[PDB]
Structures are given as C-alpha cells and as structure tokens.
Amino acid sequence: QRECISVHVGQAGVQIGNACWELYCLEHGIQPDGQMPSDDDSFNTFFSETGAGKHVPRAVFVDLEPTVIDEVRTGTYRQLFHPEQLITGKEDAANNYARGHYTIGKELIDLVLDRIRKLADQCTGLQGFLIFHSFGGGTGSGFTSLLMERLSVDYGKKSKLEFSIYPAPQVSTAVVEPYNSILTTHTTLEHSDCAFMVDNEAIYDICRRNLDIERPTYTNLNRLISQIVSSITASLRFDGALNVDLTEFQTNLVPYPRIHFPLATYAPVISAEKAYHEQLSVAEITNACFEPANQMVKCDPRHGKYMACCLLYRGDVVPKDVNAAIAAIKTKRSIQFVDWCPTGFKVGINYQPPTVVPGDLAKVQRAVCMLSNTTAIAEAWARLDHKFDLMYAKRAFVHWYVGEGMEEGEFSEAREDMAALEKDYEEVGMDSVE
Amino acid sequence: MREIVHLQAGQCGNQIGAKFWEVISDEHGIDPTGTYHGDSDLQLERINVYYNEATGGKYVPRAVLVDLEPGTMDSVRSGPFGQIFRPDNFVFGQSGAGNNWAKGHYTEGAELVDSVLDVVRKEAESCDCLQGFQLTHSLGGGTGSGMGTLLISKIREEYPDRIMNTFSVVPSPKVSDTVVEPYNATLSVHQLVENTDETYCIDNEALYDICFRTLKLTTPTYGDLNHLVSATMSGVTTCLRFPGQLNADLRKLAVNMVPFPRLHFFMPGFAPLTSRGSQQYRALTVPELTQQMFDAKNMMAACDPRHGRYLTVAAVFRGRMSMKEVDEQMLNVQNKNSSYFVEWIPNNVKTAVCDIPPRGLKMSATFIGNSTAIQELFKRISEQFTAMFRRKAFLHWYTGEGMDEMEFTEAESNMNDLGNPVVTRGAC
Amino acid sequence: MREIVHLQAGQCGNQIGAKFWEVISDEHGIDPTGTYHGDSDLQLERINVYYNEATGGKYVPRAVLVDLEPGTMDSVRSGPFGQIFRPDNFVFGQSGAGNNWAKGHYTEGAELVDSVLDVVRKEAESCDCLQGFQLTHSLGGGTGSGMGTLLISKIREEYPDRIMNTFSVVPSPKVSDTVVEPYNATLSVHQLVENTDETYCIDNEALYDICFRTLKLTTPTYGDLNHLVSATMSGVTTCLRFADLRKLAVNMVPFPRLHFFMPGFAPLTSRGSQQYRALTVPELTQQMFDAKNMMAACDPRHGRYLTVAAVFRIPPRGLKMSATFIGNSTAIQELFKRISEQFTAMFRRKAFLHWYTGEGMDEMEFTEAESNMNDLGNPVVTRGAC
Amino acid sequence: QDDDYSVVHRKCRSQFTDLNGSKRFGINTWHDESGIYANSYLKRKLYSLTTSPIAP
Amino acid sequence: DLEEDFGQAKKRHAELCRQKRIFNARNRIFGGDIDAWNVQVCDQKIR
C-alpha cells in the first residue's frame, strides 16, 4: 500500500543500492533467490509480490557504463532483481556533466522512464522516490539531473528524496567534482523535495573513531548509508507508537521550500567490542546525534542555527524517555536553535530494532536517526564554491563541456544561484529584531 | 432516555477511544466478543446509551472511527476490544494528513467528511431521544484537529439542540511531539470556540506529571495516559448510565458550568489516584477524594489554577456516600479558598453523586474545572504562533492546500479574543 | 480533639524525630508495620493527637520530614519504625545544604519551603482543632538552622494562634562537630525569638553528662541521646495524650521575649543501681531539680529559677513513676553568651562569610542578628538581679 | 586473613531519588516505596541487640 | 476466517512479547544481546 520507488544512479548509487538491498532483504526475510522461507504486508514498500511467492525489488539501477551492473548480475543477488530493471548504456560518462546530461542521457532516458512508469503502475499508493547518487561522476550528476527534470513534469505531485554523496571538503577523488557539483546542485535544487547529503570524509571519521576500523572502505560507508535510509523508511515498513510518514519527513524538516537540505546522523554506530562499556540509553543515543563528530558531513553545527529536527527511534524505546532526552537537549547552550521555531522537534517511534548484517555495526535494541535542518551546511556549500571559483577563474576543463554540447553560461548561472542559496540561508538563520 | 454518539478522530483520539471503550466495557460487562456476562442487573438498565443492540443479545459501540491513514485502524482492530466495533463504522482514507490542519480541513479530509457524516447520521438517527456527541481528538497535529473541527462544524449545523463534548489533547509547554503543533492548535481553537458546548483540554505533560508523582508508575506509557482520560470520561458520563442521588447529566453540567457561552474550556480531573506502595497509608473517604480533587497537581491540563480564579466547579462522585458530608466538604473548600473563586458567582460548585462506583474501588470523584487559569494555555500557544508566524515559516503547505494569510491572523486574533473575556472575569 | 503536627528539619532533627516516633509508637501500642497491637483501651482513647487514621486501622504519624540532602530521609525509612510514615511526607532536596544558613534560608531552602508548606497545610487541613506544631531541629549546621527557621517563619505567618514547640539542639561548650555552628546558631536564635512560642534548648554535652555520670553507660550512642530527648518530648506532650501546651506556655512564659527552656526527665537510674532504687515523689523531685540531669549545658545554680514545671506520670511503659521538668531560668544567659563571643571572634576578622555573602546575603545581616541577640540578653540579666 | 566482606554498612538503592526504574530487576510496574532495603535483614539483627537506656 | 485468526494471534503474541520487554525497566533503559555481541566479536576476530 505504502510503496516507494528507488532509483540508483551511478557507481555510488549502484553500490549503495547493493548495501541497501542486502539490508532490506535481511530485514524482511527475502532470500537472494527472491523467496521468503517463512511464508505479512511489510514487503510492499520495497518489494512486489509476483506469483509463486517471488519478491521483486521496486528499484531501477541506472549506469551509463557496464560492469558495475554486471557485478550485480553475476553475484549473489542476480535472481533477485528483474533484468529489465538494471539498465546500462555503452559509454562511460567520464566525469562529465555534459556527457551525463546532454548527449549520453538520451539513449537511456526513454527506457528508464518506461521502467519507472511500469513500477508506478504496479503501485496503489506511491509514497515517493528515493534517488541515490553522488555529486561526483558524470552519470551521477548529469543523468540524475535529467531524470529529475523528466520526473518533475511526469510525476509532479509525488515526493522525492535525494540521497547524494557530497564531495569531501579536503580529500575527494577527482579534479572535475567541483564543476559537476555546482552544475548539479542548481538543477536538483528545484527538483528535489528533500535532499540528504553525506560526505565521505565524515563517514571516514565516524568509521575510524566509533567503529575502530583503521582502514574503512566503500562497503562500510554504503552499509552505514543503508542503515540510515532504512531507519528513515521504517515507520512505513513496520508498526510503532508514533508512526511518521514520508510526507511527515518532508513536513517537519522544511520551514521554506528552498531549505530542504537536512543532515542525517545515526546512533549506535558502536563496534561490538565497545558496547560492553556504555549503556546506549535513549539519552546517550540522542546526545551522540547532536555531538558535532557523528555528523555525516564535515560541518560544525555549533557554527550554525538548528532550524528543525526529526528523531526516528527504532526498538524498545518509550516516549517518556524520548521526552526526557529532548528536555535534556533543550537546556544546553551549545545546541542553539532559532528563535522562530521554539518547538523544534518531531518524534517518530517504531517497534522494529535494526537488523544486523554480518559486518561492522553492533546488535542494539535502540537506535535513532536524526534528520536535522540547520544553517551549518553553508560551509560545505561554500568550500566547493571556492574550489569552483579558483578553477573557473581561468576556465580549466571547460572545453570538454562546451565541445560535448552544453553552453558556457551554465557555470556562472549555477554559481550565482548557489550564492543566492547561501544568502537565503543566512537570511533565514539570522534572528528577529523588529 | 438519552444517548451520546462517540466519535474518535486521529491517532490520539482513536487510541484514547480504543481505551474509553475497554474501560466502559469492563464497567458494564461486555466481553471482547460483544455479548454480556456480568454480575448485577442494573448494568443493562441504561446500556442503550453507548451501545447499540445486535443479534444474539450482544452489544456494539455507537462509535465512529475517523482517520486519514489506515495504520491505527489495524491497531484498534488488533487491540483487546477490537472485535466489537462496527466494521462499517471503520471509515478511513488511503492518504496522509502529514500533521497539517490544511490537509484535514480543506483537502482529503473534506473529501472523506461526507462518508463520515453518512455513518454519523446513521448512528444519530438510530435513536429516539439523542443527547449529544462526544469527540476525542488532539489539537496538536492533523486529522484530529482539522477533520475533527470540520466534523464538529457540520454536526453542529445539522443538530443544533444536541450537545457537543470534545475531549481534546492540547499541546504542552514542556515537550512537543510535532513542530507545527502551534499552527494546528491555533487553527483548531477558533473552530472549537463557537461550535462546541463542553471542551476538555488535556495536557500530556500534566498526564505524565500525575503518572510520575501521583501514580508513581515506573513506566508511564500511552495506554496508561489514555486510561486516565478514559476514567475521567466514564466519571463524567455516569449519572445518565447508573442510578444515583442528585443525578446530573451532561446538559445540567453544561448549564451549570458554562456561565457565558464562549467560556467553556474545562480542566478535567480524577482523584481516587493512589500508588500501590502507598495504598495502605491512605484513608480514601469524602475529604480525601475532594482533597486530592482540588489539589492543584492532579489537573490534567497544565494550566495552574492558583494563578487564576475558578469560575465554576463540578464534582461527579461515584459510589454511595454521605450527602451531608459532601455538601459540608464543598462548603468547606469554598470557605477555605476564597481568593481562587470569583465573587460574582456564589456557591459555584455543583455536586452529583452516583451510587455505583467504578471497578476496583468503592468511592471515586471526577473533577470539571472552568477557571481563569485556562488563559495560560492560550497565551502560550499565541506566543508560539506569533513567534513562528512572525517569519511565516512552515506555511507553504497551508498556502498550497488553499488557506490564506488572513485566516492565520483571524485565528490568532480569535485566540486573543478569548484571552480577553477570561481575564475580564478574573479581574471582575 | 487536639492534635500536633510534627515537622523535623535536618539530619539531627530527622534522627531525633525517628526515635521520637519509635518511643511514641511504643507508648501507644503501634507496631513498626502500623497496626495497633496493645493491651489497654485507654491508648486508643486519644490516639488522634499524633496519628492520623488510614484504611484498615492503620495509624500513620502526622509528621513532615524535611532534609535538603537526599540521603538522610532514606536512612529514616531504613530505620526500625521507618515503615510507618507517609511516603509523600518525605519531601527532600536533590542538593546539599552544606552547613550553611544561607543555603537553607535564601536559596534551595527557599525554593523547597513552598513544597514543605504545601505538605504542612496538607496535614493541617485534615484535622479539627490544631493546638500547635512541633519542630525538631539542630540549631547548628544547615537545614535545621536555615530551612528550619524559614519554616518557623512561614508557619507563624500562616497559622497565628498555634503553639510552636521547637526542640533545638544548641551548640555545646566542650565539643563542636562543625566550625560554622556559631554563625548558624547566632543567625537562627534571632528567628527563634520572634516566631516560636516554646524553644527547648537541648545540648549534647549535657546529654552525655546525664548518660555518663548518672546512667553509667560505657559506650553511649546517638540513639541513646535521641532517646533521652524523645522521652523528654513525650513527657512534655503526654497531658493531652493521656496542664496542656497553652497552660504551660501561659504559666511559664512571663514576658513574651524570654521563653528558652531547660528540659529534663528524671525517673533515671543506671542498671547497676536500679535494684536499690526506692522510687517515690521526693526521690523524683531530688532527681529532677539537681543540676546533673539538665539537658542544656548551662548550670541553673548560676542563675535564678524564673518558672518551673513538673509533669508527673499513665506512666511510660516499663516504668513506675516518671517526672518531666521544663524550666525557664536566668541560666540560659550562659548559652547565648558563650556563643556570642564565638560569633564576634569569627566575625571580627571577617572570615567564613564569603560563602554566606555569595548566596544573596549582605554584611549588615550578621551585625543586626548579633545586635538583637545581645538585646535578648538584657531581659535575661535584669530579671536575674531584679 | 585478608578481608571479610561486611555488607552491614553501605548505602543501598535509593527508594526516593533516581526513580527511572532502571535499578531493580524484573518487571515492576510500581515504584518501590515499601521500606525494605536489601540491607534490612543484615541490620535489623543489630537493632534487636540495641538496648534502650531506661530500666534495662 | 482462519487467516484472520492467524493474523490476530500474531499481533497478540507480538503485543505480549513487547509488554514483557518494555515493562522491564532495567533491560529497557540499558541492555543488549550479550550473546549476539560475543558472536559478533568472534566473527570480527575470524575475519
């Protein structure tokens, strides 16, 4: 009844989708074959029940280049995904927003939209879309932007959540990532209803400090992102005390339409041989989310203004303890909210503790995902703005775009509206004086 | 004979009504399956007040279940007394309120309200002499506020001579479970003023306050918090369900507790409330019931009644008990506390005593307090609404669903316009 | 009927009142559970002076038990007759007084006095004809001094014709278990003078004088001391349980300022000398009036007996003929003058007072307290020499 | 020998402060407010021995 | 009818189990599956 459609774009989207769908399969019980051994209804939000007990995921994997889909089509989950869902091109987008958005997007947009239309037809009530991508590669920027442009005109009333990997403030992996990021945040600003962004360096710090992994990898990062998104879409999977919907996720974060960039944090990221020594009580897991080191981007919320927060509790948790943790938070002067949102908390509780994939995270009967809309994200925006300004001062790599087909002024116009988005952020975050 | 049609809207209202019905079913004698197995004769004398007859000598609630999301219907059905309601009365929509008053009053709530009014007419015309309606909801959040107030407006238009009691959970200063609770409460209070006859404002902070110090419970949960409200509801609607001396029904309560029509925002109370470990150290009698009942830490709204004068007070006692002792105690409380009662309403306490106590007790008391102190709630919600409408944030949803910027100002001015009489009466 | 509301301030007051409730429960026939298990029907005749009724014949003390530290009241519950009090009468603070008068009078104590006045009103309403209140406190330290005298002030403001019996444990000449006890005692005798109706000065040095030189104990304990104090209390209040409070105050307070009393209790015999005792009225009078059984360490021979009472005893259980002394004499001058020099010595160099001025007090409070405590003195030197 | 673990004198679980309930085992739906600290038995013994110093 | 009985039995058993889990105050406030933590430590050391 309460279905939602997942669209994974790019290499990051595909590997995060692998982690997400293995977590979902272990959550409900669907085998890699696609058959529940036990033999409910909770397999509607992600799965579709075709006859003879077969469960097909509600996902579309898109990449313009092969072998990242062929790893899925060869590996353990090859019988799970319907082969028409997994869609490949024949040319790599080559870290080029121009290639992903203007020339090699048009050989695949019709097929991807046809598959998404079939999925939406195989749905009674569609809650929304979850688009998993990055602000890096040409696929994950350009084809994601073109997908949102088509989905906005064809499915305008539906909800959209972006789950995007924002570039690191320091390390990153490419020389063209600032250009692609400036080009794509401006096209996904007006076409994403709510956009959660995670930063590889911040997940690196979380894995190295809380999970005791001196050498974390993309498997650990995407499994953490899988746990975050599963904690988000959990109240519309299982039953709880305060079940909160996707429209409530959209509601209790945004005060204004242009401010739809919350930060997600997860609680118990603990590492098995550290959980013997802490209580992991509800107050502790609420404090660890507000701590400015468990954040999934490298920004300090102390240099900012918390607009709103949604707390998503899973497991054996009581609203008495939730209210006590909220009251303990609302006395500290470090977590300084805005003066126009006094009641700045929304709570949601479901009775299902997170499942454990055999791996890094520890088995806990309490978790919370924090979705916090705050003004501290302007630093992460402005650092990539600084990088883009340095490169675009004397027009590095611009010939690739303008020979691939996209006009010169896109860079300047995207930069201008990014600066406008900044100015909106400080204009909202500043206090009332009249 | 008299009848009250029970209506429950939203998550809070549905789970509170899923309780009110369990408590009153154990009070009357109905099993979870629906037929009667009790102990005494007078439980079925007035059973056609909240229960409609069915075949085989079983009885079903006269309740209408309203929600815009099919998630709490299943919990109500899977609850203890779930296989007792009419499945035709399980009216629900496959959509999302999203904690918006706009999507409950001017969008899909206004589409489902016709099918809701259908069964409302059905259960209100399967009668001979109706007394009124009892709606349980929460002002904070969607569905219960928006659809609840639209339902109130349509029912009050259709049946004006019958009463409209609303047991409503208002947002509390301490903890908030929704960031647009001030918007929902401010837009709902304006419809609550000039429609309903008896509003009962209930604060979750005050309910947890009672559960932590009066009840001394280790784990106060939502079922318990709704059960206190259920006990208050069953105490209020008692003299019309069991015989007693000086019976007071809901209309006599309305005429003796609403002096002027707009000032009807009551503070409910319930006071045979003792902890198990302190049970044997108590002396529950007439002074103890009145004593805990006028104690200003048992009020289920977080409106402190020593910061404002009581306009009117109602005490509905249960259990058979000394009428002279009750009258002397009600004279004694008025004589002792002279600054908390207004001078222009003399002897402003009304007394009902029903003979049959609630289960588990011998004597009980239910409090209804209409006081000046209700102004703190509306001043607080007005402050929240002015702070969060000053920047007019959290508002594009309302302008997209079809509200106007003038309507928010109208609701704020009407909440202040109720803040004015409640301070004129307090300052004579 | 007449009744007494028993409030107890501090660690010292809490333990004294715990032993007081033990001896009163033994005197009337109440088990530690609370059920009446006695042998005489006259014990339940006027039981509603210290015990409120409950369901099933459960008699609960009409006591409010206060302490700003949340650990002493747990010990009071863990005591022998601990399962007799109301649990909601155990009003407490989640902090510490820390032997500070301002930390009971102008801070947390003044934040908690509202709840204590609530509970005291809560007990006083469910009654018929209240004769007076009964506060047991230590004059030194915190809680009993600061919070205790603030309690006395608010109770005097609210209930104006009810006798305040405050059993105050004054500082001792020989020994001093704290250091700021002259500050606390000099700042609290001021509030004791114009508020209370009957102050009972009880000193631990005099208690040990009794327990060693007359009782011949070898290891006297704090429970032993509080037992002597509680026996004196029961002898004071036995007249309305089996010359009441109004009569004793009227006949024994000549002028309204001077009312500090010497207590005593004297059917007192050691175990080694009990079998040779010949208990009679002249023996009880000789054991009474002699200055070895005084409960406050100021010698009555040094002064003039202004007024003297003698409550002779239904006797207390296990005894034949008991005798309780309460006396106003000019010897009480010594108790105030011994600590006035301590206060002026510790104040001349302006020490120990930064942790009184930091809580919200001024410099002039101590000087005015010392001035009016000295002005207490001239009414107790003038009557000693006409 | 080295030591005897004396359980007579230590502060037991507070029956009046810290009433979140996460200090006593099992399901307990009411706060423990009957005075029976887990040191009562090993102390009521000493009390029995204590004597009152009036006519002993 | 039988499928509805199966479903209602599942909800009743889940409600009873959650009653016994969240009405246990100590294990609710702080607690975890120590056996699962031991197995996870062993799996981590093996890997």
Binding site: A241, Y351 | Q15, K19, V23, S75, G79, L215, L217, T219, T221, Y222, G223, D224, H227, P272, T274, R276, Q279, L284, T285, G319, M321, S322, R359, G360, L361, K362, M363 | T55, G56 | T29, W30 | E15, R18, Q19, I22, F23
Partner: peptide, 22 residues
C-alpha cells in the same frame, strides 16, 4: 456502615495501569 464507607482499593484497580505497549 463504616466497613463500606471506607474505601480499600482492590487488584481490579491496579490491574488496569500498564496494559499496553503503545
């Protein structure tokens, strides 16, 4: 008359508190 003017709460009053997980 006193034996029923007194109110002693029974187990049917304490068995209604803490009955649901929500």
């Amino acid at each position: 008359m006193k034996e029923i003017y007194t109110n002693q709460p029974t187990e049917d009053y304490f068995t209604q508190f803490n009955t649901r997980s929500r």
